[PDB]
Short mmCIF file of C-alpha atoms and ligand atoms in Angstrom, two decimals:
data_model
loop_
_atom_site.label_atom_id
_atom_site.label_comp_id
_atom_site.label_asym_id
_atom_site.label_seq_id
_atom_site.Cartn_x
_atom_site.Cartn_y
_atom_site.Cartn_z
CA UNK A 1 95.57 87.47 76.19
CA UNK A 2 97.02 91.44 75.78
CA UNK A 3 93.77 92.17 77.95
CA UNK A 4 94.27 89.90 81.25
CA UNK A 5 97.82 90.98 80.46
CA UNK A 6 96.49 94.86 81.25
CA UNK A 7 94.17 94.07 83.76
CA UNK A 8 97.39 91.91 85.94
CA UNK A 9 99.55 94.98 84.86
CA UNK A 10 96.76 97.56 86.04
CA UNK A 11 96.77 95.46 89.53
CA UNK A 12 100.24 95.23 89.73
CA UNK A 13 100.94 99.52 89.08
CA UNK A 14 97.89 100.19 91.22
CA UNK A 15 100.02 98.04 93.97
CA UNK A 16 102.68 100.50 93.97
CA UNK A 17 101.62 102.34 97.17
CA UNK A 18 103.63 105.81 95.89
CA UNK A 19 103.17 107.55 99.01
CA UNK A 20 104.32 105.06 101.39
CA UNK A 21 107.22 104.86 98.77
CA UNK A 22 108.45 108.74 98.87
CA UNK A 23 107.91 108.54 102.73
CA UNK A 24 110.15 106.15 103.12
CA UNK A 25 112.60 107.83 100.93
CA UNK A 26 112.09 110.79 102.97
CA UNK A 27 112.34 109.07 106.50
CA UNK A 28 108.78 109.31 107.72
CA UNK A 29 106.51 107.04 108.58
CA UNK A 30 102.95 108.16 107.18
CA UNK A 31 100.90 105.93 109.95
CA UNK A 32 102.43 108.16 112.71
CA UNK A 33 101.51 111.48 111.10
CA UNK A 34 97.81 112.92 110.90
CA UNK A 35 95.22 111.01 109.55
CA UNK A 36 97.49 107.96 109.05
CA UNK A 37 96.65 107.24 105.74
CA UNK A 38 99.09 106.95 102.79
CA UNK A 39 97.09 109.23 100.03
CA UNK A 40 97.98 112.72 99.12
CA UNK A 41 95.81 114.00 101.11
CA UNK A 42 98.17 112.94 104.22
CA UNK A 43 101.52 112.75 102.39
CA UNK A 44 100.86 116.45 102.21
CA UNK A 45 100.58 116.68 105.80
CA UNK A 46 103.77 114.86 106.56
CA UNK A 47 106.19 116.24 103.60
CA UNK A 48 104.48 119.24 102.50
CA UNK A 49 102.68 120.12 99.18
CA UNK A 50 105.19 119.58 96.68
CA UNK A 51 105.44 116.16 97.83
CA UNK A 52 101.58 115.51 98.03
CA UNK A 53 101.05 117.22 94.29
CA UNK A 54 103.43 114.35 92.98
CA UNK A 55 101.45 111.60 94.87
CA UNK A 56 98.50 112.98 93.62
CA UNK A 57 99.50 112.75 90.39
CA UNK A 58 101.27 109.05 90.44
CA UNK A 59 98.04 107.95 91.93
CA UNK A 60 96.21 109.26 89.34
CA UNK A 61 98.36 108.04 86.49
CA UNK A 62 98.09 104.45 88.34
CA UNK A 63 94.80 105.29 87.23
CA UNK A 64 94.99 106.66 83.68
CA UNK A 65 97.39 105.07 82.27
CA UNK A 66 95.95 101.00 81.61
CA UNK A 67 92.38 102.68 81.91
CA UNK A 68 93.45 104.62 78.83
CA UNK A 69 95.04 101.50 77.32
CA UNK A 70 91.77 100.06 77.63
CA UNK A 71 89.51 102.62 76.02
CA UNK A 72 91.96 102.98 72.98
CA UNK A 73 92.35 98.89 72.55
CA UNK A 74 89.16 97.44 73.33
CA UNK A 75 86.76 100.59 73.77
CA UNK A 76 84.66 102.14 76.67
CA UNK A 77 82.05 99.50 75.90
CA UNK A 78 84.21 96.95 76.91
CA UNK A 79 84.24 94.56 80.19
CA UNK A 80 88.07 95.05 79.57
CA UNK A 81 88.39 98.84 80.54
CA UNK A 82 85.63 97.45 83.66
CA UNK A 83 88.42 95.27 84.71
CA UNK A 84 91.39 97.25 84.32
CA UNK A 85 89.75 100.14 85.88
CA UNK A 86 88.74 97.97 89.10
CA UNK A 87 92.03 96.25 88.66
CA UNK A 88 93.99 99.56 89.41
CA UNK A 89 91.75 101.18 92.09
CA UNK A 90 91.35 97.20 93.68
CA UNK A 91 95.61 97.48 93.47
CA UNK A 92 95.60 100.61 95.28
CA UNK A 93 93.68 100.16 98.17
CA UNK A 94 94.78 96.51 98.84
CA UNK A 95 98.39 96.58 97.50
CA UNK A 96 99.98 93.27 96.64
CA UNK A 97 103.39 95.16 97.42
CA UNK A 98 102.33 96.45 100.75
CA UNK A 99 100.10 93.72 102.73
CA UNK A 100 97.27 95.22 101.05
CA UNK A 101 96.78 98.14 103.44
CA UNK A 102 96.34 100.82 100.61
CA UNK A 103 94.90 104.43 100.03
CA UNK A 104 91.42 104.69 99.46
CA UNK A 105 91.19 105.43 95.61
CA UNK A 106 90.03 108.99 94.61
CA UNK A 107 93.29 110.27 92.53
CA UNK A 108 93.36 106.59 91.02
CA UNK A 109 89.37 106.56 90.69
CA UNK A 110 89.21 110.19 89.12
CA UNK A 111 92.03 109.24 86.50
CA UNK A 112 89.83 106.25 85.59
CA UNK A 113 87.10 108.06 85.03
CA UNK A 114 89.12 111.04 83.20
CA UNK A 115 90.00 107.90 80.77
CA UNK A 116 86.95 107.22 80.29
CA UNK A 117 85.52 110.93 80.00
CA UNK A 118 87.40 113.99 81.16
CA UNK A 119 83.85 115.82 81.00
CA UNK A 120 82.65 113.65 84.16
CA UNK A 121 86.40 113.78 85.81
CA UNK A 122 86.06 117.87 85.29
CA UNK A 123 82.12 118.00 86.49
CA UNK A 124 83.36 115.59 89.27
CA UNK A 125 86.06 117.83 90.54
CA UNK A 126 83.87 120.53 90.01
CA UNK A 127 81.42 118.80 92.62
CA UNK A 128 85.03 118.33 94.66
CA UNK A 129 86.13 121.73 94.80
CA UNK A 130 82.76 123.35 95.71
CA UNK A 131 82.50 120.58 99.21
CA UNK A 132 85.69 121.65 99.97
CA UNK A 133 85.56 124.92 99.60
CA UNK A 134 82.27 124.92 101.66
CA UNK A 135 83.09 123.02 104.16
CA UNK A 136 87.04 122.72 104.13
CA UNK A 137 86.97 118.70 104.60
CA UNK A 138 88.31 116.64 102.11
CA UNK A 139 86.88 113.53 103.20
CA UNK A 140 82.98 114.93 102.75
CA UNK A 141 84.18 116.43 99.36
CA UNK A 142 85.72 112.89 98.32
CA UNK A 143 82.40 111.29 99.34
CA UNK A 144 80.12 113.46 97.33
CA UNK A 145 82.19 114.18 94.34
CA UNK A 146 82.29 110.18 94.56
CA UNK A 147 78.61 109.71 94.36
CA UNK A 148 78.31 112.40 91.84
CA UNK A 149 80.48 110.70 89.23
CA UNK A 150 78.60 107.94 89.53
CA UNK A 151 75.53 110.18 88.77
CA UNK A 152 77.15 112.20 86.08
CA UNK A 153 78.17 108.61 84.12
CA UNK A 154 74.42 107.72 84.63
CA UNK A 155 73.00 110.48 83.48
CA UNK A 156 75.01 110.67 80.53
CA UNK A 157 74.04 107.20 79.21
CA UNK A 158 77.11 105.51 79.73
CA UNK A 159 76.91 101.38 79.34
CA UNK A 160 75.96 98.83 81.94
CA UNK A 161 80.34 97.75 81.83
CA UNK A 162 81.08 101.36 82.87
CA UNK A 163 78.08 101.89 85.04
CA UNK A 164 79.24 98.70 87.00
CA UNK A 165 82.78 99.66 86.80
CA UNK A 166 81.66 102.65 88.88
CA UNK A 167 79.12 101.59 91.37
CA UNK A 168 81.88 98.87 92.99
CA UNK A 169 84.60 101.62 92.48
CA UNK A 170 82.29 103.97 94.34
CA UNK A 171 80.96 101.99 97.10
CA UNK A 172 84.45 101.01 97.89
CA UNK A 173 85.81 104.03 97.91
CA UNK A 174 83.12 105.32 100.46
CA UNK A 175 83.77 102.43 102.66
CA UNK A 176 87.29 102.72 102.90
CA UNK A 177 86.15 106.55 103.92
CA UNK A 178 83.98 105.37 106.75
CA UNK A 179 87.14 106.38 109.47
CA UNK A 180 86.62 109.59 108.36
CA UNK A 181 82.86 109.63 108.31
CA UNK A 182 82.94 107.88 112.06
CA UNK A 183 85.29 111.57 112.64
CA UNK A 184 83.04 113.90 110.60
CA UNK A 185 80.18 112.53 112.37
CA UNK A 186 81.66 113.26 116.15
CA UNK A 187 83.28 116.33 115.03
CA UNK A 188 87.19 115.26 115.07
CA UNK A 189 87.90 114.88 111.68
CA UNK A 190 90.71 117.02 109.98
CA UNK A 191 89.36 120.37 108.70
CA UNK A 192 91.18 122.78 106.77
CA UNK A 193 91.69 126.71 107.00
CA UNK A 194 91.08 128.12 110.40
CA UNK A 195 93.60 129.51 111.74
CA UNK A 196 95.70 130.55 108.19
CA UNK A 197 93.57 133.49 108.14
CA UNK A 198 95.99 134.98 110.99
CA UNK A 199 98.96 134.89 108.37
CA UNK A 200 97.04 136.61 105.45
C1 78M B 1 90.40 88.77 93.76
C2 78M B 1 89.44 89.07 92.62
C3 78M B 1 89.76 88.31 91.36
C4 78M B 1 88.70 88.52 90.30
C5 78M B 1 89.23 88.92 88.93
C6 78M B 1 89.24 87.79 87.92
C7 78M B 1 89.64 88.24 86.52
C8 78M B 1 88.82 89.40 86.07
C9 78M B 1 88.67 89.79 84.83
C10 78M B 1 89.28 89.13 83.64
C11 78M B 1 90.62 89.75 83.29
C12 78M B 1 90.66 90.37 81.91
C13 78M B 1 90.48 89.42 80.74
C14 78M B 1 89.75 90.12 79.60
C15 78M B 1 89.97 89.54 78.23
O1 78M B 1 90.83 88.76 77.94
O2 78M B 1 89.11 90.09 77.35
C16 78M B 1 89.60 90.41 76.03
C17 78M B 1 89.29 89.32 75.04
O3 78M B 1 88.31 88.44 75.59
C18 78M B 1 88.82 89.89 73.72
O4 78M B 1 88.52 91.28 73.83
C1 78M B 2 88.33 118.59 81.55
C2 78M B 2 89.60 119.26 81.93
C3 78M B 2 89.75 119.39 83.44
C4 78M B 2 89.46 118.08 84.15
C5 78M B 2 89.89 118.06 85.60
C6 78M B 2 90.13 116.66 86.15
C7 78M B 2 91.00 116.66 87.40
C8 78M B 2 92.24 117.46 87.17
C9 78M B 2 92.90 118.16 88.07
C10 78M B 2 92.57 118.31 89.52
C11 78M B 2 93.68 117.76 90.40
C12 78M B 2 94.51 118.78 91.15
C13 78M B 2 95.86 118.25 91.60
C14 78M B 2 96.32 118.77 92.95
C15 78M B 2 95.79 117.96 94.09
O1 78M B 2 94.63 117.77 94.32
O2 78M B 2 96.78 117.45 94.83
C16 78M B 2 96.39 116.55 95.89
C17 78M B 2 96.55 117.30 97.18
O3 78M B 2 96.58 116.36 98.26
C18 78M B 2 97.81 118.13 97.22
O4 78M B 2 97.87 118.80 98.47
C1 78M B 3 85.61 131.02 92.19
C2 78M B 3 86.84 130.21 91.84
C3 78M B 3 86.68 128.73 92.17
C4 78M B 3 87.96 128.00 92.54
C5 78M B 3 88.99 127.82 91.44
C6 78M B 3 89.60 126.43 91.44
C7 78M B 3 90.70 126.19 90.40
C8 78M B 3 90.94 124.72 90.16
C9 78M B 3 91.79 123.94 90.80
C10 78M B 3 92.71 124.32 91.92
C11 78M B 3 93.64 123.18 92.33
C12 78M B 3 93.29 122.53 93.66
C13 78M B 3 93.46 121.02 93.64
C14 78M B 3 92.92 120.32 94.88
C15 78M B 3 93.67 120.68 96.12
O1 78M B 3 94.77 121.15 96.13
O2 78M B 3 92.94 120.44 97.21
C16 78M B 3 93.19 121.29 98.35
C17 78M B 3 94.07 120.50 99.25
O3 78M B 3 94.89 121.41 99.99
C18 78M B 3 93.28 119.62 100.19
O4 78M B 3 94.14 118.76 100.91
C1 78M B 4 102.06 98.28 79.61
C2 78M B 4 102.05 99.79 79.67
C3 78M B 4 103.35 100.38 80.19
C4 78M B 4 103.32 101.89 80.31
C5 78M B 4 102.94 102.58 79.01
C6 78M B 4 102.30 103.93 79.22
C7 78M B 4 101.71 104.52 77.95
C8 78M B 4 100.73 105.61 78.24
C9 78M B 4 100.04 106.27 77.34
C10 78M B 4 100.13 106.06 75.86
C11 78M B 4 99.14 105.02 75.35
C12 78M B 4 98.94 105.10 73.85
C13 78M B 4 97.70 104.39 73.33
C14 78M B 4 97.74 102.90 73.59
C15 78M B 4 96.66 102.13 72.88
O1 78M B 4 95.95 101.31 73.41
O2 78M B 4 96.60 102.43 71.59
C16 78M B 4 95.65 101.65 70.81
C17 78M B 4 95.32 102.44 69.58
O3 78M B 4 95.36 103.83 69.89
C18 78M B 4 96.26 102.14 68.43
O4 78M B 4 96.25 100.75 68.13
C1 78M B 5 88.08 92.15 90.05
C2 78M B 5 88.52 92.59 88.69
C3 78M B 5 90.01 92.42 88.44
C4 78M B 5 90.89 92.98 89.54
C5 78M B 5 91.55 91.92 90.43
C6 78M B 5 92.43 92.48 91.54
C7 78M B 5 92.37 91.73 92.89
C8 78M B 5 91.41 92.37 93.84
C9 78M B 5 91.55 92.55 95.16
C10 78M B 5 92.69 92.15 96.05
C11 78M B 5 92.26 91.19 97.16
C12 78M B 5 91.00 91.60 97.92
C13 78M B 5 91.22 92.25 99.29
C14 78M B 5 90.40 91.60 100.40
C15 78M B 5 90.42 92.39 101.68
O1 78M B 5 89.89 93.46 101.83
O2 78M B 5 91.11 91.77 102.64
C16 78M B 5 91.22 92.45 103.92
C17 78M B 5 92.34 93.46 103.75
O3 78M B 5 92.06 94.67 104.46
C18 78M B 5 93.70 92.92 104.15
O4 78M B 5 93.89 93.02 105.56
C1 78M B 6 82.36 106.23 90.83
C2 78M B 6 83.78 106.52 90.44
C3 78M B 6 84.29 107.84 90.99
C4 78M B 6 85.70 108.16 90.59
C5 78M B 6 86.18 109.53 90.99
C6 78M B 6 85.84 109.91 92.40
C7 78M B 6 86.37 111.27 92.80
C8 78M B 6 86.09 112.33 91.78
C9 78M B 6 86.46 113.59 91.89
C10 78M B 6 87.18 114.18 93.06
C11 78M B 6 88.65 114.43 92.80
C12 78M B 6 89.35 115.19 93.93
C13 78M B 6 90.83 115.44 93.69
C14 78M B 6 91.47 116.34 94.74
C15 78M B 6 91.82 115.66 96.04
O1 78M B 6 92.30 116.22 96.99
O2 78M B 6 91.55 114.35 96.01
C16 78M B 6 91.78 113.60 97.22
C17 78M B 6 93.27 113.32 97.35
O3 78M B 6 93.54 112.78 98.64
C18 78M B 6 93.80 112.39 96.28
O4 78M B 6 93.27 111.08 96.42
C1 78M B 7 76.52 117.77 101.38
C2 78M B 7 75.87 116.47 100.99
C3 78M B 7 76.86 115.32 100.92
C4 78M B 7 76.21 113.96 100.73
C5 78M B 7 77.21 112.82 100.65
C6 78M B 7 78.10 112.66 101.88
C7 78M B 7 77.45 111.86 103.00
C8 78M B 7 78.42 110.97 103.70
C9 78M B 7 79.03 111.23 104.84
C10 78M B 7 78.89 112.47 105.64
C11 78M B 7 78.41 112.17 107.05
C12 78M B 7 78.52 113.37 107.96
C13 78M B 7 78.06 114.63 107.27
C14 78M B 7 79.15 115.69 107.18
C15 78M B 7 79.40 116.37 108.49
O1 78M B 7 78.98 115.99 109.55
O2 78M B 7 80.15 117.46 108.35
C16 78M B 7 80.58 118.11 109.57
C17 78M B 7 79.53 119.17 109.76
O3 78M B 7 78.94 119.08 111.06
C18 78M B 7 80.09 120.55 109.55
O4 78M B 7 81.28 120.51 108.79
C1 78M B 8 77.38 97.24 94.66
C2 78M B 8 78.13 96.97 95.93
C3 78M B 8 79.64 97.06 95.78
C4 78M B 8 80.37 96.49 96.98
C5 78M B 8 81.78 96.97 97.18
C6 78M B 8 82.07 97.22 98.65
C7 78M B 8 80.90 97.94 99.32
C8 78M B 8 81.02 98.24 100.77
C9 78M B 8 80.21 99.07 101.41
C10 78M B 8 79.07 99.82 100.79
C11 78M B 8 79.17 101.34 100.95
C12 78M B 8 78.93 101.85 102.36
C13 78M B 8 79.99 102.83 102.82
C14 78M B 8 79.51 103.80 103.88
C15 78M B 8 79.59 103.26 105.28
O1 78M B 8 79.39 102.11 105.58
O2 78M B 8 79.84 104.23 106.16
C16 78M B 8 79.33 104.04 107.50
C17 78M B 8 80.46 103.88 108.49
O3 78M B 8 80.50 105.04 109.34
C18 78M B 8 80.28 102.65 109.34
O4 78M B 8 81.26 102.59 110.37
#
């Protein structure tokens, strides 16, 4: 009753495709600039950083928010946080609201899983930041923080509910990735950092 009430609302919010929204406040189309895709990571690209912070962060809550509502009604043991969690990454990438051409789920994702345990979001990002900072590709950091927070909830002894909830989040996420892996892989994917070291 309240809980297929929170996973519809979770589907609904994660069908709010916020940077497709603020783009079109701002005039630009985010399929015509850089990577094409509708995330932060490319809403940064076409509006600049302040803009991309605030996507980040509305994707993330789209994430948080019924997750959190979850784990304080029913608990992290439930099949209810499972389903609102996959409910608002599932809403994100395939967007009711937007003819389900979504984002591919790693601000949503990570404020599941901070819901759930900000420990495994930090060690996550943790995983995050060190790709990146290696190898200046957000895509291959996405992919193997991804992975990791699967291992990390795993390890940790999390329940079969959450351990599910993460394995489809996970695999999805990856596979809505494999543009970028296709670019990584034949060396024309969008790297960060070259040639800003002329300017510092
Ligand atoms: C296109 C994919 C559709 C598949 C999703 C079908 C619905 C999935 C999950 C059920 C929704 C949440 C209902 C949970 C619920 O009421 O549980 C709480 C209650 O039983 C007591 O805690
Ligand atoms: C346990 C306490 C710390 C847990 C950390 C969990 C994740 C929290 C913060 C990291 C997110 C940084 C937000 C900025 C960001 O990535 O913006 C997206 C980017 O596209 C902007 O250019
Ligand atoms: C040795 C120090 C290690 C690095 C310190 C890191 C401090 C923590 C978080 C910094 C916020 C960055 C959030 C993610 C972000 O903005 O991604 C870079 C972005 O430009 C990629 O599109
Ligand atoms: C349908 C939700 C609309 C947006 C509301 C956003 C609220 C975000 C965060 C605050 C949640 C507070 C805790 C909610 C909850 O499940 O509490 C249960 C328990 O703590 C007390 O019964
Ligand atoms: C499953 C647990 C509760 C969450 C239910 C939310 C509904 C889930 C998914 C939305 C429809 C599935 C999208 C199917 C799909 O990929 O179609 C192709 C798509 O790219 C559209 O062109
Ligand atoms: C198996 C479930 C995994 C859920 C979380 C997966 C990702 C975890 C940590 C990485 C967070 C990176 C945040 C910074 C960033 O730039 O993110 C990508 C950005 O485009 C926002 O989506
Ligand atoms: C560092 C280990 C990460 C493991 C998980 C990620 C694996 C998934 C996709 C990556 C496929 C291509 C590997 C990355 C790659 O080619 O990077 C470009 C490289 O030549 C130098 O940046
Ligand atoms: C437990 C399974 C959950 C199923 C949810 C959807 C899973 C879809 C794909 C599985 C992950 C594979 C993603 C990596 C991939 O295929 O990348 C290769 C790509 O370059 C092919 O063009």
């Amino acid at each position: 009753g309240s809980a297929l009430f929170l996973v519809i609302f979770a589907y609904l919010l994660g069908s709010i495709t916020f940077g497709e929204v603020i783009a079109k406040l701002k005039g630009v189309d985010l399929r015509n600039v850089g990577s094409g895709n509708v995330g932060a990571t490319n809403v940064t690209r076409a509006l600049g950083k302040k803009y991309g912070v605030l996507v980040f962060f509305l994707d993330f809550l789209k994430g948080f928010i019924p997750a959190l509502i979850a784990v304080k009604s029913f608990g992290i043991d439930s099949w209810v946080l499972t389903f609102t969690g996959l409910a608002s990454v599932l809403g994100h990438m395939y967007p009711v609201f937007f003819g389900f051409k979504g984002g591919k789920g790693v601000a949503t994702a990570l404020g599941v899983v901070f819901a759930v345990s900000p420990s495994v979001a930090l060690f996550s990002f943790l995983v995050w930041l060190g790709i990146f900072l290696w190898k200046r590709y957000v895509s291959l950091a996405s992919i193997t923080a991804t992975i990791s927070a699967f291992l990390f909830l795993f390890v940790a002894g999390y329940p079969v509910n959450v351990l599910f909830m993460a394995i489809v989040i996970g695999a999805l996420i990856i596979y809505r990735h494999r543009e970028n892996i296709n670019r990584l892989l034949t060396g024309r994917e969008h790297r960060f950092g070259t040639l800003e070291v002329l300017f510092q």
